A = this chain, B = another copy of it.
Amino acid sequence: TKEDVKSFLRRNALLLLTVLAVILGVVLGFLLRPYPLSPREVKYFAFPGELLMRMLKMLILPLIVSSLITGLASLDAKASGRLGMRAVVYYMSTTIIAVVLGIILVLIIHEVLDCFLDLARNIFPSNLVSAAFRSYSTTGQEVEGMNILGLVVFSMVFGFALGKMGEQGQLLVDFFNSLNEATMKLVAIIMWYAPLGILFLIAGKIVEGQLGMYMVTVIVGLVIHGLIVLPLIYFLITRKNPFVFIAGILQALITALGTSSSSATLPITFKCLEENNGVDKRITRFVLPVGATINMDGTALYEAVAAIFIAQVNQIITISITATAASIGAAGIPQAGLVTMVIVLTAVGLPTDDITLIIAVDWLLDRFRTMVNVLGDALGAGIVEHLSRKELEKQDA
């Protein structure tokens, strides 16, 4: 039992390094906490964690495009719809269970139109080159930050258009498969930088009562949905140990607990499922890019608790529907999850000005929130893969 320890210290050496970086990140951060938290000084200390995010976000653009293009071309007309329906039924339910449990824990223990239009404006981009670095935000009208929604949508219909012309449109698919493979080699390179980054990402961010109880409500709620409810969903589908599957994607969850972005961690998550858990590439390039942008189970729970927590200052159907709708939401400027807090409160009738209270604790919750967002699509991949046994068998020979 205590003899086979060295065989684990050599195998998962980097997995121990990113864990030790989480340990040392708490160490160095609290060590430099008594010193002044000057804006420049903080941003200079949080620079090796900043460099990591630049390498990580540069890799997502040629990843999501090449993923969905080959992902839909390598699937039949009915096979693409089937795999999709299996994923959507999973996405909607996992964002509906997290909101239900999220509403229970808080009730037991404790322009809006222009947003709909901008999302629709972003689903159909006016320019593709622009979409690769610009999103639409009304009131000039194009804000900085890649329009992932417009790219995901275009990549799907373009990829499916290739999968409908076959022989002619094989060249482009063979181009996008080599490009997806090249960025999957680049992710193995940037993988080694992760410990040095995850350290300064959480070391630099810790140098920044009534909220005390709220913090535990969400944290425990996320543990019940993520480490209790979600593994039971996997066992109800595959009948395989999920706590061994989750172990394989640890390097992606540990980084999610640092980066706080399912986007920044999607290339590592892609490697953790294609290499460690050995999931079929045909479904990773399909489920993972969509899942990271739409399936946000960690967000659904946090949006529900925050809406009822501010009600203490002062019709659950108007809150449960909006919090599930906020999870699919990715409009305007890219943020930490506070970008959609105005929309979730206006539709019900709660005070919008009560947001400044939760922002002080939000940053530590964001790290746990992202872990569930990644765990949602990660476990979801196995569930969709197991449910698409016929579709994946027919593709070979």
Contacts and interface: CB of A to CB of B under 8 A. Distances in A.
Contacts of A158: 182, 186
Interface string A48-72: 0011011101100110000000000
A126 B54 contact: yes
Given A171-B174, A171-B178, A157 B44 contact: no
B175 A127 contact: no
Interface stretch (A128-136, A216-224, A240-248): A128-136
Interface in A155-170: 157-158, 161-162, 164-165, 168-169
Given A117-B47, A133-B129, A146-B127, A182 B178 contact: no
Interface SS majority for chain A? helix
Task: State the oligomeric state as a number of copies.
Answer: 3
Contact of A129 (B44, B124, B129, B185): B129
A54 B182 contact: no
A113 interface: yes
B189 A165 contact: no
Nearest to A140: B144
Contact of A58 (B120, B127, B161, B177): B127
Given A55-B124, A124-B55, A133-B129, A165 B185 contact: yes
Contact of A61 (B55, B127, B168): B127
B54 A121 contact: yes
A179 interface: yes
Contact residue range for chain A?
35 or more
A258 interface: no
A169 B178 contact: yes
B186 A165 contact: no
A44 B178 contact: no
Contacts of A132: 127, 129
Contacts of A128: 58, 61-62
A146 B128 CA distance: 11
Given A53-B126, A61-B129, 19 more contacts: A54-B121, A54-B126, A57-B126, A58-B128, A58-B154, A61-B127, A127-B132, A127-B133, A129-B129, A129-B133, A158-B186, A161-B182, A161-B185, A165-B185, A168-B181, A169-B178, A169-B182, A171-B174, A172-B179
